[PDB]
Design an enzyme around this catalytic site. Structure first.
Site: not given
Length: 114
Positions: A112-113
């Site tokens: 996600g990051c």
């Protein structure tokens, strides 16, 4: 491999992320921060580092993924310092929010990051 901290042996993946992610606390964060198998150098955790670490971990506990970098930077500008851009985040975490910050925050993956 493993990480010895607090009389325990915690499981890490091949990228040094905590797989027993629910065992995380400040002590574990500290051991992860000095784990030079997965970091060129230990990272000294200032209160700014901690604000970033707590934000990432709260997001993961709530949503099951890490927040996108876009959102992290916005949060940092608002809650850490007005000039905390991505460059500033790499100054704090030399390998970046995913390889360093999410790792030290005890997320089992940085997914996600980006």
């Amino acid at each position: 491999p493993e990480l010895e901290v607090k009389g325990k042996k915690l499981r890490l993946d091949e990228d040094g992320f905590l797989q027993d992610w629910e065992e995380w606390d400040e002590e574990v964060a500290e051991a992860l921060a000095k784990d030079t198998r997965f970091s060129p150098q230990p990272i000294e955790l200032t209160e700014e580092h901690w604000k970033i670490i707590r934000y990432l971990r709260d997001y993961f506990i709530k949503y099951g993924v890490a927040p996108p970098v876009r959102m992290l930077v916005k949060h940092c500008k608002k809650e850490v310092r007005p000039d905390c851009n991505l460059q500033y985040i790499y100054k704090l975490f030399p390998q970046g929010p995913a390889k360093d910050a999410c790792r030290i925050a005890g997320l089992p993956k940085p997914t996600g990051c980006v």
